Amino acid sequence: APLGPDLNPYLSHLARMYNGYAGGFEVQVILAGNAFTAGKIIFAAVPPNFPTEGLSPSQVTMFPHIIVDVRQLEPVL
Amino acid sequence: NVIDPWIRNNFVQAPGGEFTVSPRNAPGEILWSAPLGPDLNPYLSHLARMYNGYAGGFEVQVILAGNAFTAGKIIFAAVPPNFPTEGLSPSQVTMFPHIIVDVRQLEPVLIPLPDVRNNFYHYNQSNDSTIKLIAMLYTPLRANNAGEDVFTVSCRVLTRPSPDFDFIFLVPPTVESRTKPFTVPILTVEEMTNSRFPIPLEKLFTGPSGAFVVQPQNGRCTTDGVLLGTTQLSPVNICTFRGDVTHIAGSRNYTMNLASLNWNNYDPTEEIPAPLGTPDFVGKIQGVLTQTTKGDGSTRGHKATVYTGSAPFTPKLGSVQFSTDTENDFETHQNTKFTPVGVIQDGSTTHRNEPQQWVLPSYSGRNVHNVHLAPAVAPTFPGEQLLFFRSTMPGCSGYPNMDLDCLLPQEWVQHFYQEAAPAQSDVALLRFVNPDTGRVLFECKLHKSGYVTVAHTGQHDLVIPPNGYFRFDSWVNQFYTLAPM
Amino acid sequence: NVIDPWIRNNFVQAPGGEFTVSPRNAPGEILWSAPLGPDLNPYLSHLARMYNGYAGGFEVQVILAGNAFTAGKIIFAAVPPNFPTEGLSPSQVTMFPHIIVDVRQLEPVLIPLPDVRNNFYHYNQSNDSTIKLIAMLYTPLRANNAGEDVFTVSCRVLTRPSPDFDFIFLVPPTVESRTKPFTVPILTVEEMTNSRFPIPLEKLFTGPSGAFVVQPQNGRCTTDGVLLGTTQLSPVNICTFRGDVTHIAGSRNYTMNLASLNWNNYDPTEEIPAPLGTPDFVGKIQGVLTQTTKGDGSTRGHKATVYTGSAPFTPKLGSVQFSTDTENDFETHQNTKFTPVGVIQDGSTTHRNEPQQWVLPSYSGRNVHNVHLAPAVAPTFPGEQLLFFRSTMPGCSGYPNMDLDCLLPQEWVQHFYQEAAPAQSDVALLRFVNPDTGRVLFECKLHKSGYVTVAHTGQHDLVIPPNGYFRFDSWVNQFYTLAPM
Amino acid sequence: APLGPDLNPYLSHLARMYNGYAGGFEVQVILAGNAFTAGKIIFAAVPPNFPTEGLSPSQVTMFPHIIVDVRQLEPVL
């Protein structure tokens, strides 16, 4: 998905009031966790020009990234 | 650290970096330039695509055909690509980074090429390219030899990568699938055959769509190979008959319950106006009816006279009458086969009338209209004229409408069925090139619908060389107008 | 030394594998075939397109995904480089170094291969064929459950080179293209037409080469398009004649002042056996002679009986006799044309005799034989049988020798004329493929002169699916034989 | 040709810009071609209304002028 302030619909309907914005924003993810399941997941950071179609599960690790498994009972950012 | 050191330590020439220098050229003028980039070493080209991100400069150098008898200086420099130099000076380039040398030198010399980089990396394709090349002369090099070519000094520019160079990113790129290049058949029309009658064509014709109500069913196909109309593939199946006759003793006729090419009986429930390859125009044609008894080979053969406009001729129903020159020769329900040779002008009356090439026959008799008819044609871009294929038909009696204009060559139909090439844009551009001239004599406008036209006025049987092939060139839009012939 | 670390460190996919296994199976079954090499990895196929020298090995690596409770096993193995693997035994697979693998292992599996090397190099711009790939089903993997064919078990290949593997030599890339890739028409026998008579083909035939003198002159061309024999381009131009008949006023005969396809007056001095479209056999045939007066078109047409075994049949000299049914109708010095329809049997009292399809007629007469002979055919790697094209010609009188065998398909000749392809080795490999199943009924052995044989014995009209087409594969040497039928 | 500030495109622009005009120039000529010809060229002054089509070179010798051969490498003024 395109990272931007177009994610929170409240931020959408309060974006139009102001023409200039700055600063980042942090997001997180939750999972349907299960102690019987074993499988890891990987999220990362990528500039938008960089075309990824079928490259690897490996070569994204040079970027900023984070790895977690499918069993987790907390949100992770 | 991802390069074999041969590439790192061996200068390579340019793909085109060669330029003549004569004393006859004026000083302070340009000689040669090139976009500076990693698109210079062809090895760097074919190892650029593997990596999406690169950085760092690279140094190049130049060699000269040196000579101790010649005196003339040269100047190379550094220039941002926006900076337009057409005729400025031999002087004002000196504010930049530059280097000067004379034409007598027995070593390669390298231009300085300053690092404007701030450790930033482009993408691999980045064409907004900096530090573009330079070829400037300084003194016009009298050369003191007084020949016809007074030391015409040649030279090459010579490139390699820098030490600090890399290929950061990674990708599996590809050019995986090439579309078919829309290859056109390279016969001539005299070599090519009529698609609405089993004859070879004789010439092509140019004429307007308003003259004749142009809507045939034989010779109708797409550009990717979808079968349309009654157009089939085997050109001998055009206007011929196969089936099982039924007969009456009194007249010269046999109503023939039709069959396919392999004599499987015709079924009237296909999405068709008529069987494939039927004559799609009203006429009276005399060929030869030929019957073999299907047991061991009791044959017979006589000429016949068929009537494509009449009512017992019902191809969509599956019965056809042939008024032969005999009456009861052809036996019952055998392999009876009509094959046309020539059109006749029966029962006197008016000359040059039959066949009525632009009207549709009695497919289902007089009752049921022809369903799933291929569309008619007209120049949607106005002023143009359709490209007919003109021949004369044979005959046994009279002066019939022998002037036959078909739409397509049959070999092109099966060839484009073999092509299976989807069109990229609407209208293709084909050029009739004569290789005896090595050039075009006339071009044409070909749509992806499956008909071709040209923007020239009047009735023209185009004079053609018998050796001229056809050369497809390019893809025009819907509104190209052709130049006159 | 020459290569990147990362591409050697970890495994990377292969595009040919990735394939799935449904639980409905029959064991001892081959699933997927592939040739091993550096063209497996797209990375390595690029890098080997770049270079020349090629030495080391790989590690083939396989991951499975699907069900677990199946209890069914898979085999990956080595193979001889030319080895039929269709319905064979799994014990043969047990002779080679192989690995049995069940779906219960989570770790991705690796099959080791024979380990050799030839340290000078391996070509890498050739066939250079080596151990191909074996995807072999051990245990039919039933997946006992309530579902039907559920959890389709996928099988991927994801490799990386062996740590000894490396390159040595580098070339300019020259990535562009091959020659003509020897494309074939995809027609059937009903769509293809006879190259010795204007009729559609009926069936292909195989039979012994010692039966007849197998040397025609219509249907002769090269694999790159030089005109051989009396073979021409158009299928309707065969066996028909054009010119200016002269009144044999006492009989039905007509000696014709010879004209070409374009009615150009015939030159008897050309380096040819006979004019184009001229027959290459002895037989009696009734077709129809047709004449149109050049002034206005006073048309006439009557059935003519021709004899290429006759004395006034002299096509190389410039005269040919036509015994019509009428005697004085056809005017002299007019555009007179004979067209045949089918061979007859007036005969010498012998049934099924004409055309004597293998003998040669009187081109320059009986006195001096034909010149510039396209030679006969022969199975050079013997024990194999030729390829005939069995057809049936019609008739008008008697019981003719209807079994007509021609040499090439006429569409394929002009197809090669468009190709103009230079050969790569001795014998090409074409496969008759039934696309209803995507499987081959029989293969072929096409020789670079322009003929083709098959490795079988006996008189067989080859049964074919009428949806079946032909698909070119590769270049085989002149010492490999095919499987019989 | 007529001499003036419209000779140099630089100066023709700059004199289109301005009004007042005073001083002179230095006309400077370079040759390029053969050397073994032994043939000479004259550049001269002229009356401002003077027919010059088929006239005498002695008239050209009356005005301040310069004879120049092709053998000089230095550009002539």
PDB file of N, CA, C and O in Angstrom, chain B residues 247-297:
ATOM      1  N   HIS B 247     -31.873 -37.129 -58.584  1.00  0.00           N
ATOM      2  CA  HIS B 247     -32.198 -36.748 -59.960  1.00  0.00           C
ATOM      3  C   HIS B 247     -33.558 -37.063 -60.574  1.00  0.00           C
ATOM      4  O   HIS B 247     -34.262 -37.989 -60.173  1.00  0.00           O
ATOM      5  N   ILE B 248     -33.890 -36.244 -61.569  1.00  0.00           N
ATOM      6  CA  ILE B 248     -35.114 -36.349 -62.344  1.00  0.00           C
ATOM      7  C   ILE B 248     -34.706 -36.626 -63.789  1.00  0.00           C
ATOM      8  O   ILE B 248     -33.820 -35.967 -64.331  1.00  0.00           O
ATOM      9  N   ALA B 249     -35.357 -37.605 -64.405  1.00  0.00           N
ATOM     10  CA  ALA B 249     -35.060 -38.012 -65.777  1.00  0.00           C
ATOM     11  C   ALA B 249     -35.291 -36.941 -66.846  1.00  0.00           C
ATOM     12  O   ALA B 249     -34.531 -36.844 -67.811  1.00  0.00           O
ATOM     13  N   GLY B 250     -36.336 -36.140 -66.673  1.00  0.00           N
ATOM     14  CA  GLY B 250     -36.707 -35.132 -67.652  1.00  0.00           C
ATOM     15  C   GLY B 250     -35.776 -33.990 -68.035  1.00  0.00           C
ATOM     16  O   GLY B 250     -35.701 -33.654 -69.217  1.00  0.00           O
ATOM     17  N   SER B 251     -35.070 -33.385 -67.083  1.00  0.00           N
ATOM     18  CA  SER B 251     -34.212 -32.270 -67.437  1.00  0.00           C
ATOM     19  C   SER B 251     -32.751 -32.642 -67.203  1.00  0.00           C
ATOM     20  O   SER B 251     -32.413 -33.770 -66.837  1.00  0.00           O
ATOM     21  N   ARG B 252     -31.877 -31.666 -67.412  1.00  0.00           N
ATOM     22  CA  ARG B 252     -30.437 -31.837 -67.275  1.00  0.00           C
ATOM     23  C   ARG B 252     -29.940 -31.599 -65.857  1.00  0.00           C
ATOM     24  O   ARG B 252     -28.748 -31.355 -65.669  1.00  0.00           O
ATOM     25  N   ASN B 253     -30.817 -31.682 -64.864  1.00  0.00           N
ATOM     26  CA  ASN B 253     -30.527 -31.215 -63.520  1.00  0.00           C
ATOM     27  C   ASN B 253     -30.295 -32.367 -62.551  1.00  0.00           C
ATOM     28  O   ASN B 253     -30.764 -33.489 -62.750  1.00  0.00           O
ATOM     29  N   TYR B 254     -29.553 -32.062 -61.489  1.00  0.00           N
ATOM     30  CA  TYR B 254     -29.387 -32.936 -60.337  1.00  0.00           C
ATOM     31  C   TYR B 254     -29.362 -32.070 -59.090  1.00  0.00           C
ATOM     32  O   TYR B 254     -28.449 -31.262 -58.922  1.00  0.00           O
ATOM     33  N   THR B 255     -30.350 -32.237 -58.215  1.00  0.00           N
ATOM     34  CA  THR B 255     -30.339 -31.558 -56.926  1.00  0.00           C
ATOM     35  C   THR B 255     -29.418 -32.323 -55.978  1.00  0.00           C
ATOM     36  O   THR B 255     -29.650 -33.500 -55.678  1.00  0.00           O
ATOM     37  N   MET B 256     -28.340 -31.668 -55.557  1.00  0.00           N
ATOM     38  CA  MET B 256     -27.243 -32.337 -54.876  1.00  0.00           C
ATOM     39  C   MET B 256     -27.254 -32.006 -53.393  1.00  0.00           C
ATOM     40  O   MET B 256     -26.896 -30.893 -52.999  1.00  0.00           O
ATOM     41  N   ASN B 257     -27.658 -32.979 -52.577  1.00  0.00           N
ATOM     42  CA  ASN B 257     -27.594 -32.832 -51.131  1.00  0.00           C
ATOM     43  C   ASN B 257     -26.140 -32.842 -50.686  1.00  0.00           C
ATOM     44  O   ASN B 257     -25.461 -33.870 -50.769  1.00  0.00           O
ATOM     45  N   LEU B 258     -25.678 -31.695 -50.201  1.00  0.00           N
ATOM     46  CA  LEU B 258     -24.255 -31.413 -50.123  1.00  0.00           C
ATOM     47  C   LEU B 258     -23.559 -32.188 -49.013  1.00  0.00           C
ATOM     48  O   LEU B 258     -24.188 -32.852 -48.185  1.00  0.00           O
ATOM     49  N   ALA B 259     -22.233 -32.099 -49.026  1.00  0.00           N
ATOM     50  CA  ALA B 259     -21.386 -32.703 -48.017  1.00  0.00           C
ATOM     51  C   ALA B 259     -20.152 -31.828 -47.845  1.00  0.00           C
ATOM     52  O   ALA B 259     -19.950 -30.855 -48.575  1.00  0.00           O
ATOM     53  N   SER B 260     -19.318 -32.186 -46.873  1.00  0.00           N
ATOM     54  CA  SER B 260     -18.138 -31.394 -46.549  1.00  0.00           C
ATOM     55  C   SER B 260     -16.985 -31.759 -47.482  1.00  0.00           C
ATOM     56  O   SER B 260     -17.168 -32.378 -48.535  1.00  0.00           O
ATOM     57  N   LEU B 261     -15.773 -31.340 -47.099  1.00  0.00           N
ATOM     58  CA  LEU B 261     -14.581 -31.657 -47.879  1.00  0.00           C
ATOM     59  C   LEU B 261     -14.296 -33.152 -47.875  1.00  0.00           C
ATOM     60  O   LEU B 261     -13.963 -33.731 -48.914  1.00  0.00           O
ATOM     61  N   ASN B 262     -14.445 -33.800 -46.718  1.00  0.00           N
ATOM     62  CA  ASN B 262     -14.263 -35.240 -46.597  1.00  0.00           C
ATOM     63  C   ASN B 262     -15.567 -36.004 -46.792  1.00  0.00           C
ATOM     64  O   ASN B 262     -15.730 -37.103 -46.246  1.00  0.00           O
ATOM     65  N   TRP B 263     -16.512 -35.410 -47.528  1.00  0.00           N
ATOM     66  CA  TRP B 263     -17.799 -35.987 -47.922  1.00  0.00           C
ATOM     67  C   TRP B 263     -18.697 -36.338 -46.735  1.00  0.00           C
ATOM     68  O   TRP B 263     -19.664 -37.092 -46.894  1.00  0.00           O
ATOM     69  N   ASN B 264     -18.415 -35.804 -45.548  1.00  0.00           N
ATOM     70  CA  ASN B 264     -19.394 -35.837 -44.471  1.00  0.00           C
ATOM     71  C   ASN B 264     -20.507 -34.852 -44.793  1.00  0.00           C
ATOM     72  O   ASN B 264     -20.241 -33.704 -45.152  1.00  0.00           O
ATOM     73  N   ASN B 265     -21.750 -35.315 -44.659  1.00  0.00           N
ATOM     74  CA  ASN B 265     -22.912 -34.583 -45.153  1.00  0.00           C
ATOM     75  C   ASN B 265     -23.100 -33.256 -44.425  1.00  0.00           C
ATOM     76  O   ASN B 265     -22.834 -33.150 -43.224  1.00  0.00           O
ATOM     77  N   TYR B 266     -23.528 -32.242 -45.173  1.00  0.00           N
ATOM     78  CA  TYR B 266     -23.711 -30.904 -44.634  1.00  0.00           C
ATOM     79  C   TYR B 266     -24.838 -30.864 -43.606  1.00  0.00           C
ATOM     80  O   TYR B 266     -25.888 -31.490 -43.780  1.00  0.00           O
ATOM     81  N   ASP B 267     -24.607 -30.113 -42.525  1.00  0.00           N
ATOM     82  CA  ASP B 267     -25.601 -29.897 -41.484  1.00  0.00           C
ATOM     83  C   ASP B 267     -26.028 -28.438 -41.481  1.00  0.00           C
ATOM     84  O   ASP B 267     -25.168 -27.556 -41.345  1.00  0.00           O
ATOM     85  N   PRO B 268     -27.322 -28.131 -41.608  1.00  0.00           N
ATOM     86  CA  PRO B 268     -27.745 -26.727 -41.739  1.00  0.00           C
ATOM     87  C   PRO B 268     -27.799 -25.940 -40.436  1.00  0.00           C
ATOM     88  O   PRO B 268     -28.395 -24.855 -40.426  1.00  0.00           O
ATOM     89  N   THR B 269     -27.217 -26.422 -39.339  1.00  0.00           N
ATOM     90  CA  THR B 269     -27.345 -25.750 -38.053  1.00  0.00           C
ATOM     91  C   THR B 269     -26.010 -25.274 -37.491  1.00  0.00           C
ATOM     92  O   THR B 269     -25.753 -25.451 -36.295  1.00  0.00           O
ATOM     93  N   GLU B 270     -25.158 -24.686 -38.317  1.00  0.00           N
ATOM     94  CA  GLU B 270     -23.970 -24.006 -37.827  1.00  0.00           C
ATOM     95  C   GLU B 270     -24.198 -22.499 -37.837  1.00  0.00           C
ATOM     96  O   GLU B 270     -25.141 -21.994 -38.451  1.00  0.00           O
ATOM     97  N   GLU B 271     -23.317 -21.775 -37.143  1.00  0.00           N
ATOM     98  CA  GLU B 271     -23.391 -20.314 -37.079  1.00  0.00           C
ATOM     99  C   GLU B 271     -22.796 -19.726 -38.359  1.00  0.00           C
ATOM    100  O   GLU B 271     -21.715 -19.139 -38.380  1.00  0.00           O
ATOM    101  N   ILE B 272     -23.537 -19.903 -39.450  1.00  0.00           N
ATOM    102  CA  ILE B 272     -23.019 -19.640 -40.792  1.00  0.00           C
ATOM    103  C   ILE B 272     -24.110 -19.017 -41.640  1.00  0.00           C
ATOM    104  O   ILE B 272     -25.309 -19.228 -41.409  1.00  0.00           O
ATOM    105  N   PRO B 273     -23.717 -18.227 -42.642  1.00  0.00           N
ATOM    106  CA  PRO B 273     -24.673 -17.924 -43.719  1.00  0.00           C
ATOM    107  C   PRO B 273     -24.799 -19.066 -44.707  1.00  0.00           C
ATOM    108  O   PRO B 273     -25.863 -19.247 -45.316  1.00  0.00           O
ATOM    109  N   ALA B 274     -23.741 -19.855 -44.855  1.00  0.00           N
ATOM    110  CA  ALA B 274     -23.607 -20.847 -45.913  1.00  0.00           C
ATOM    111  C   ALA B 274     -22.428 -21.743 -45.552  1.00  0.00           C
ATOM    112  O   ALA B 274     -21.697 -21.451 -44.597  1.00  0.00           O
ATOM    113  N   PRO B 275     -22.232 -22.857 -46.268  1.00  0.00           N
ATOM    114  CA  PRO B 275     -20.983 -23.612 -46.113  1.00  0.00           C
ATOM    115  C   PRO B 275     -19.743 -22.791 -46.440  1.00  0.00           C
ATOM    116  O   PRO B 275     -19.789 -21.787 -47.152  1.00  0.00           O
ATOM    117  N   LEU B 276     -18.624 -23.236 -45.880  1.00  0.00           N
ATOM    118  CA  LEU B 276     -17.359 -22.520 -45.976  1.00  0.00           C
ATOM    119  C   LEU B 276     -16.840 -22.596 -47.407  1.00  0.00           C
ATOM    120  O   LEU B 276     -16.715 -23.689 -47.969  1.00  0.00           O
ATOM    121  N   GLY B 277     -16.548 -21.441 -47.997  1.00  0.00           N
ATOM    122  CA  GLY B 277     -16.041 -21.384 -49.352  1.00  0.00           C
ATOM    123  C   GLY B 277     -17.085 -21.380 -50.442  1.00  0.00           C
ATOM    124  O   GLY B 277     -16.728 -21.552 -51.613  1.00  0.00           O
ATOM    125  N   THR B 278     -18.359 -21.202 -50.102  1.00  0.00           N
ATOM    126  CA  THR B 278     -19.397 -21.095 -51.118  1.00  0.00           C
ATOM    127  C   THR B 278     -19.245 -19.790 -51.898  1.00  0.00           C
ATOM    128  O   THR B 278     -18.685 -18.820 -51.377  1.00  0.00           O
ATOM    129  N   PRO B 279     -19.688 -19.751 -53.158  1.00  0.00           N
ATOM    130  CA  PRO B 279     -19.721 -18.477 -53.891  1.00  0.00           C
ATOM    131  C   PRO B 279     -20.683 -17.500 -53.238  1.00  0.00           C
ATOM    132  O   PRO B 279     -21.883 -17.758 -53.134  1.00  0.00           O
ATOM    133  N   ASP B 280     -20.140 -16.373 -52.784  1.00  0.00           N
ATOM    134  CA  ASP B 280     -20.913 -15.352 -52.093  1.00  0.00           C
ATOM    135  C   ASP B 280     -21.427 -14.270 -53.029  1.00  0.00           C
ATOM    136  O   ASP B 280     -21.578 -13.112 -52.612  1.00  0.00           O
ATOM    137  N   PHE B 281     -21.708 -14.621 -54.283  1.00  0.00           N
ATOM    138  CA  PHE B 281     -22.242 -13.680 -55.253  1.00  0.00           C
ATOM    139  C   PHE B 281     -23.049 -14.406 -56.322  1.00  0.00           C
ATOM    140  O   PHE B 281     -22.707 -15.517 -56.733  1.00  0.00           O
ATOM    141  N   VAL B 282     -24.122 -13.750 -56.767  1.00  0.00           N
ATOM    142  CA  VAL B 282     -25.052 -14.316 -57.742  1.00  0.00           C
ATOM    143  C   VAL B 282     -24.378 -14.376 -59.104  1.00  0.00           C
ATOM    144  O   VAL B 282     -23.862 -13.368 -59.586  1.00  0.00           O
ATOM    145  N   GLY B 283     -24.383 -15.554 -59.722  1.00  0.00           N
ATOM    146  CA  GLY B 283     -23.830 -15.700 -61.055  1.00  0.00           C
ATOM    147  C   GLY B 283     -24.222 -17.028 -61.665  1.00  0.00           C
ATOM    148  O   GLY B 283     -24.973 -17.813 -61.080  1.00  0.00           O
ATOM    149  N   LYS B 284     -23.710 -17.264 -62.874  1.00  0.00           N
ATOM    150  CA  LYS B 284     -23.971 -18.488 -63.625  1.00  0.00           C
ATOM    151  C   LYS B 284     -22.643 -18.999 -64.170  1.00  0.00           C
ATOM    152  O   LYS B 284     -22.129 -18.465 -65.158  1.00  0.00           O
ATOM    153  N   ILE B 285     -22.106 -20.041 -63.540  1.00  0.00           N
ATOM    154  CA  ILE B 285     -20.723 -20.475 -63.719  1.00  0.00           C
ATOM    155  C   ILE B 285     -20.731 -21.885 -64.290  1.00  0.00           C
ATOM    156  O   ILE B 285     -21.496 -22.739 -63.829  1.00  0.00           O
ATOM    157  N   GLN B 286     -19.889 -22.130 -65.294  1.00  0.00           N
ATOM    158  CA  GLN B 286     -19.785 -23.450 -65.906  1.00  0.00           C
ATOM    159  C   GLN B 286     -18.442 -24.077 -65.564  1.00  0.00           C
ATOM    160  O   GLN B 286     -17.399 -23.653 -66.067  1.00  0.00           O
ATOM    161  N   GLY B 287     -18.479 -25.106 -64.728  1.00  0.00           N
ATOM    162  CA  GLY B 287     -17.306 -25.907 -64.463  1.00  0.00           C
ATOM    163  C   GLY B 287     -17.484 -27.316 -64.977  1.00  0.00           C
ATOM    164  O   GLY B 287     -18.094 -27.523 -66.031  1.00  0.00           O
ATOM    165  N   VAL B 288     -16.962 -28.297 -64.248  1.00  0.00           N
ATOM    166  CA  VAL B 288     -17.094 -29.702 -64.615  1.00  0.00           C
ATOM    167  C   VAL B 288     -17.644 -30.460 -63.416  1.00  0.00           C
ATOM    168  O   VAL B 288     -17.054 -30.432 -62.332  1.00  0.00           O
ATOM    169  N   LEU B 289     -18.784 -31.117 -63.610  1.00  0.00           N
ATOM    170  CA  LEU B 289     -19.313 -32.045 -62.624  1.00  0.00           C
ATOM    171  C   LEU B 289     -18.634 -33.393 -62.812  1.00  0.00           C
ATOM    172  O   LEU B 289     -18.558 -33.905 -63.935  1.00  0.00           O
ATOM    173  N   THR B 290     -18.126 -33.954 -61.724  1.00  0.00           N
ATOM    174  CA  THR B 290     -17.392 -35.207 -61.767  1.00  0.00           C
ATOM    175  C   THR B 290     -17.885 -36.143 -60.671  1.00  0.00           C
ATOM    176  O   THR B 290     -17.842 -35.829 -59.479  1.00  0.00           O
ATOM    177  N   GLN B 291     -18.363 -37.308 -61.097  1.00  0.00           N
ATOM    178  CA  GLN B 291     -18.871 -38.300 -60.165  1.00  0.00           C
ATOM    179  C   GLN B 291     -18.069 -39.582 -60.301  1.00  0.00           C
ATOM    180  O   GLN B 291     -17.798 -40.045 -61.413  1.00  0.00           O
ATOM    181  N   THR B 292     -17.696 -40.141 -59.157  1.00  0.00           N
ATOM    182  CA  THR B 292     -17.172 -41.492 -59.063  1.00  0.00           C
ATOM    183  C   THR B 292     -18.140 -42.322 -58.239  1.00  0.00           C
ATOM    184  O   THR B 292     -18.606 -41.873 -57.188  1.00  0.00           O
ATOM    185  N   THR B 293     -18.475 -43.509 -58.737  1.00  0.00           N
ATOM    186  CA  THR B 293     -19.154 -44.488 -57.904  1.00  0.00           C
ATOM    187  C   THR B 293     -18.231 -44.884 -56.762  1.00  0.00           C
ATOM    188  O   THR B 293     -17.064 -45.219 -56.974  1.00  0.00           O
ATOM    189  N   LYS B 294     -18.761 -44.830 -55.540  1.00  0.00           N
ATOM    190  CA  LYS B 294     -17.935 -44.921 -54.342  1.00  0.00           C
ATOM    191  C   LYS B 294     -17.422 -46.328 -54.060  1.00  0.00           C
ATOM    192  O   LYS B 294     -16.615 -46.496 -53.141  1.00  0.00           O
ATOM    193  N   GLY B 295     -17.856 -47.333 -54.816  1.00  0.00           N
ATOM    194  CA  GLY B 295     -17.445 -48.699 -54.564  1.00  0.00           C
ATOM    195  C   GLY B 295     -16.015 -49.004 -54.958  1.00  0.00           C
ATOM    196  O   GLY B 295     -15.176 -49.281 -54.099  1.00  0.00           O
ATOM    197  N   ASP B 296     -15.718 -48.945 -56.254  1.00  0.00           N
ATOM    198  CA  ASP B 296     -14.396 -49.332 -56.728  1.00  0.00           C
ATOM    199  C   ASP B 296     -13.807 -48.322 -57.703  1.00  0.00           C
ATOM    200  O   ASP B 296     -12.631 -48.425 -58.063  1.00  0.00           O
ATOM    201  N   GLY B 297     -14.600 -47.347 -58.146  1.00  0.00           N
ATOM    202  CA  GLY B 297     -14.055 -46.331 -59.023  1.00  0.00           C
ATOM    203  C   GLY B 297     -14.663 -46.195 -60.405  1.00  0.00           C
ATOM    204  O   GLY B 297     -13.954 -45.870 -61.362  1.00  0.00           O
TER     205      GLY B 297
END
